[PDB]
Symmetry: C4
Subunit: 390 residues, 4 copies
Amino acid sequence: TYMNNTEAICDVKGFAPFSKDNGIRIGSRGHIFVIREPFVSCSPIECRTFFLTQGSLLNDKHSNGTVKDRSPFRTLMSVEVGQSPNVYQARFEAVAWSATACHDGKKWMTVGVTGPDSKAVAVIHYGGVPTDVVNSWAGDILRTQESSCTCIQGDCYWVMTDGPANRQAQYRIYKANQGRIIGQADISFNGGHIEECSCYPNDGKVECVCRDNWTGTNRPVLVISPDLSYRVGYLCAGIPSDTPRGEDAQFTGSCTSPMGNQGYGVKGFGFRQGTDVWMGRTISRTSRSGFEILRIKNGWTQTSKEQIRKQVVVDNLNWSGYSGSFTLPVELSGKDCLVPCFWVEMIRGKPEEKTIWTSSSSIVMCGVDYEVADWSWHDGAILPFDIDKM
Amino acid sequence: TYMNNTEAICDVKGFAPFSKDNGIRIGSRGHIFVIREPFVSCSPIECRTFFLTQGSLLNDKHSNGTVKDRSPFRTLMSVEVGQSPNVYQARFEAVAWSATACHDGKKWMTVGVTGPDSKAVAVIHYGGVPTDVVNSWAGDILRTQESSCTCIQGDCYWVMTDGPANRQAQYRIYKANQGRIIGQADISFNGGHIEECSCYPNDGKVECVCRDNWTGTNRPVLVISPDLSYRVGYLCAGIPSDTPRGEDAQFTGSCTSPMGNQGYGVKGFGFRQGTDVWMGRTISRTSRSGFEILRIKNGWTQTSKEQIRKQVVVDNLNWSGYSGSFTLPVELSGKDCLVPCFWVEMIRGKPEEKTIWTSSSSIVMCGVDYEVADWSWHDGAILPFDIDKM
Amino acid sequence: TYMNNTEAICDVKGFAPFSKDNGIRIGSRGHIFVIREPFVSCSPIECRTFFLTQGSLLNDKHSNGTVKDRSPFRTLMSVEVGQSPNVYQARFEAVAWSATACHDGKKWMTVGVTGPDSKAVAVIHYGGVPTDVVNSWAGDILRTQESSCTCIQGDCYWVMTDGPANRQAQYRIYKANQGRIIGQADISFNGGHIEECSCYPNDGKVECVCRDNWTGTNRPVLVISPDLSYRVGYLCAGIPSDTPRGEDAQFTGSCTSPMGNQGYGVKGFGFRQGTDVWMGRTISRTSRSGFEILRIKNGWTQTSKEQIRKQVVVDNLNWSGYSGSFTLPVELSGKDCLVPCFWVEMIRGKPEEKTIWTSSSSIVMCGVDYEVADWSWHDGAILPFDIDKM
Amino acid sequence: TYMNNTEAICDVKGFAPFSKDNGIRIGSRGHIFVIREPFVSCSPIECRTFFLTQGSLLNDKHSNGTVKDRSPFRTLMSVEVGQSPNVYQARFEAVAWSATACHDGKKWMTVGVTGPDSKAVAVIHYGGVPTDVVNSWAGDILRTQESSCTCIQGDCYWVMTDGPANRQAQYRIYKANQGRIIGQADISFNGGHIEECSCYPNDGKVECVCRDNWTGTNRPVLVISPDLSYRVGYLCAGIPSDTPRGEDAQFTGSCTSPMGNQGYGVKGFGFRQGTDVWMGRTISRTSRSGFEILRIKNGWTQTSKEQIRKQVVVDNLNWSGYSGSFTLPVELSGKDCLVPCFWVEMIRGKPEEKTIWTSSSSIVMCGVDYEVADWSWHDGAILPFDIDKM
Ligand SMILES: CCC(CC)O[C@@H]1CC(C(=O)O)=C[C@]2(SC(=N)NC2=O)[C@H]1NC(C)=O
Ligand SMILES: CCC(CC)O[C@@H]1CC(C(=O)O)=C[C@]2(SC(=N)NC2=O)[C@H]1NC(C)=O
Ligand SMILES: CCC(CC)O[C@@H]1CC(C(=O)O)=C[C@]2(SC(=N)NC2=O)[C@H]1NC(C)=O
Ligand SMILES: CCC(CC)O[C@@H]1CC(C(=O)O)=C[C@]2(SC(=N)NC2=O)[C@H]1NC(C)=O
Ligand SMILES: [Ca+2]
Ligand SMILES: [Ca+2]
Ligand SMILES: [Ca+2]
Ligand SMILES: [Ca+2]
């Protein structure tokens, strides 16, 4: 049976902890994959953690993490959420140095992108087998969400980018059923930049909060209809939520265009709440460190600077990283709305820490009807590791 | 289908061994979690061992167990009873430095408490996802059973405490269906102290034997009706069963109030048997060492000092620890009553042993219609470990 | 649905390899249990390997195998046949320093015996939970098959012994349904000695070939009817098949009493074939080394010395050990008879080899309609191990 | 339900990556089997990787790979495709130093060959148990596909060879249902040599592209009908695809007989495409290094030298090895044709590399409707390993 996923997102006053994997602490002695970009998507049965593998293990020489991001050894695999990305619980997903995953109620559909930068190929798996393909259409590092895709009434949608990572690139919306491409669309967005979208279903559409890696310290926003007509622009909120970025005092909002005039960025997320928004961001303005989530009254529709809530999940003395969105399917939560949730990646190792490798663990939070106290569920592993003195 | 769990507990003459996990012996070379407080609860299919994880492994530096009990790295996970708490068989349950778990016949409901001491949050999972929340209502280390909760006809009940660990605190009874809170109650118990309840179903109610960590060397007792009306007080039996405590000769019973005038304590259990009781306790009066279980004729209802049975499962030359109760569901045992069972935790390491860490394994016993010979199924691992000489 | 298991055993011309686990070779670097006495029993779905665990791992100090056979750390666990007894595939079965297992078509019933030598307790599990108990009735190391038990039309039967291991002891037949004891019987066998029976179903009865550890170099034989009436005596065949034993030339057969006038022994097996028998035995007359299986025309019913077939599975330059019987259930083989099969244990370490430990792996063979060439599927691990130089 | 597998193979313009296991990289620190000859076959649910095990682990002394190919320790086991051949995900299949596997829609049928060179035995498993046997009929290393067998409407077929590996040998076609042999056939092929067939279903027959290890640098081809009538000969294409072999310029095609006049060879594959063929081959003419796949217009039926496509999956600076064919079952792909796919083995260690061992990993590719860019998904592990300096 297909998941409807046509409900509204739940109005939430705060976030409760779902899971923490302790991959890197466990990785001190256990067999764990070196990873970046874990992420959660949920079937009507379970939410799993997907992750990019470097073909290697923590505390092993192959954890030489100075051997490429887009290496030919990168695979997407997955475990049940909370479990660590260890070999022996891992289920294989796709060859991918960039991926997205989601479930339509019957099976899982993943998308793996591998191949060379000049002509990358994206394989679409469904039910555990390749079913369709998307080639690079712009010749420059084809890529996608690095977070959960979205399924509504049997059709799944996701966002892909092909082009420069720091200038005008090209941005596309693909749509598929049972692992088969059935519609696509170009996104007209000149001056704007779209990367690594975090999407979710809301009111029978797909809402996406992504990353401007060109000139925007605010976040591009995408709203996709089943017919692949769309609205796109920036999260109206008068508070910047990318990293890096400047102070809140020095920033003015926009619905239409990028603000802050800064490059780089980090993958992040946001949740519409009527006209309000929950926006995650690192505590540091300059470092992938700390993590907080702010509610902004009318942040979805106005240049609002009205902060009505604020919750911390990673204190600023600790390393953060990527963040993305997913929903609790109705069939699991038992709600009449879509429970909004997020994961936060915690990167350890290079560049900031003095070791030969780089990996990450995660914690997962989920929207509740209550204000939840600030705390820090940081990664916690002690650096450097054994092979760090080799 | 919901488990009725409205039957009476079986009258038992003794206890037979269910399982022993050998986690720590196995942990010498295998990948095992550092743990405290394992415990058993059973679905209509299997009984699992739940446990608190320190985010770390035996024989690894992160087993630095001088890094907090209520650390942000503590998760509840579970394996099938008898299996060891190893990474690769572990199923993730909740973020929790204190937990309880139980099954209602359809799914598992766990409760994880994490967050800071001043404002702890308890997440209630059901079917593998967060469904409801309980915040700290008294600002002081919110906490609960550390043993199996109880389900009757679809509604699950458990006991929580918020307050001082060595003085008057506050004590609450929560009740839930399908992971959703549907009723709660304050327990009026002035002069008394309730901690870490071991409960079970009996005659369609929840009977709880808990821990007085204030002034009681006898055990507080709680009897909960579906409507959350209750009786509470102390196990009548004229024999003390907490640790520490004084000699039996020097002790007088009470139904109403604490006796022995001593602080501290250890989590323990007891089983009503008509008017009699089976009470577990450490053999030592002063040490978490040895473990025995006594039947006291009319110990549930009178100040009786009539010891009619006595069985040993851990001899006094060996380390014990926590103990708790659960029942064999009818659907598994094939009985017309509820088979009473217990687990016993066996703590190795600090404080008593000379190492850098502390963990534990368990053995599980189950009520039978026969007198069963005394023996010792002690932990058995050899201390210190490799990383102990580091 | 209950397995009928009322068919006849297949007439077989030889034996084909089912599985080999390589536990000890794999145990050089992997996490494997130290074990003795693996054995196979089959459900309508899978045949598993059961085994006794020492609570410890190969290549670890706890593999100090100078720490008792009947230690309080011994558990029965199981994996799918062919897999090695590693921690992470292991399913927990019972606390047991001696065990038996079998399936009735709906669930598994195991029997674990633990407790002290003077008053041992046998726990009977069914569906993963304790259901009934047998206490020591003779005060002297209560024990049983160390091989698969037998189920016919829902009732399972097995053989137990309580008494001296080298003189007249007592021998009992228990019978159970759904994990509940429903009939028992004493075996009158004066001058005879019964140990470690290898049984199977044949023509709607249970046939058992066991071990005389008193004075017999031939094997005691037991035929059990559903009503627990029985015949017992010795395998008629005029060839001895225990270890140790003397030469074949120097031996005369018996149906009634023990022959060879030698003590000790080793667990072994045999399969009726009309009036003939397949009998396994070590190649050495004095060592648990090599392994062969002989067909003796009319060996089941006469003092025959007519060797009509001979097949080798372990050459004499290699170590053998225990052997036992089981059948392929009809539901798996697709035959109209019961396919006879056996496992052979391969003991490495003390006493014969120079190491600090003792474990074993197995190979499994199964009766076919063809003559199968001799070979040696020996254990193959290289002794001593790492911890052997410690 | 039986898989029809009577459809035509899909016309494909290129190949997309299915999976890569990284076994050897992972094997640096994890517990992985030493293997040769992995291969894929698919059930209606999953495609698994089968592999030959040396009874040992990477980075362990038993990885002494100077201890025989046809050792008594070799077992076939399997994991889900993409997963690595690690112990803890491994499912046991058969005792085999040469194997084939396939699924008929209800269960798996494997075939293990073990025993001595002079009289080898092949065991046929079905549903996890031995069901039938094939003895050596020519006394000289009985053997088979080392790749997926084929099932059509419930009957499975595969090819076996018994005889000299470098001269005229004997070649047989076996056919079975539910694990039971129901028809066989001798292949008349004088002057020709058949080894290690890679087969698939196509138009309701079994097409096989195999290996001439006698005098052929082109590949023998076999087309089998349900009645075991057959055509056999050589892949017509005017381009040689074995290793070793000479230059393409120096080669003339044949449908009937071997060409190139060279010995040795390597297991390979090919896919009919109407009258065209996709043929895999190593890039090197003399080394098991690099890997490419060529489409030859009318290569199936004519001496064509018309190269219309060319795709690289392993660049020539890297080691390749065996390759074989399988199909995506309709029930998984959702196509109306049979999706053609292949795996490529990547051998590391002896003979070419300076270590004490030899193993391999794989990548899996699958036919798509699009031209897919060349790349190299090579093995990637760094040689030598730890035990390499021992
Ligand atoms: C601008 C975003 C993309 C574009 C290549 O780059 C990702 C940046 C990045 C980071 O930590 O910031 C990690 C990466 S690495 C990777 N495998 N996935 C990522 O998201 C970069 N993405 C790719 C496809 O290489
Ligand atoms: C008085 C009981 C509680 C109250 C905090 O303290 C537990 C004591 C204790 C022990 O071994 O005795 C172990 C602890 S540590 C833990 N994670 N669980 C426990 O039961 C303490 N409980 C908490 C929530 O910290
Ligand atoms: C005479 C057979 C029994 C009687 C105690 O002794 C077993 C002998 C033995 C061996 O290798 O020969 C191994 C033992 S050790 C064990 N756990 N299982 C065995 O079969 C012995 N049995 C017991 C219950 O200790
Ligand atoms: C000529 C092909 C066969 C005939 C024995 O030999 C195989 C050659 C070979 C290789 O790498 O080329 C690997 C082997 S080793 C093995 N276990 N499987 C193989 O395919 C050889 N086959 C056998 C049954 O020994
Ligand atoms: Ca930016
Ligand atoms: Ca106390
Ligand atoms: Ca004897
Ligand atoms: Ca050749």
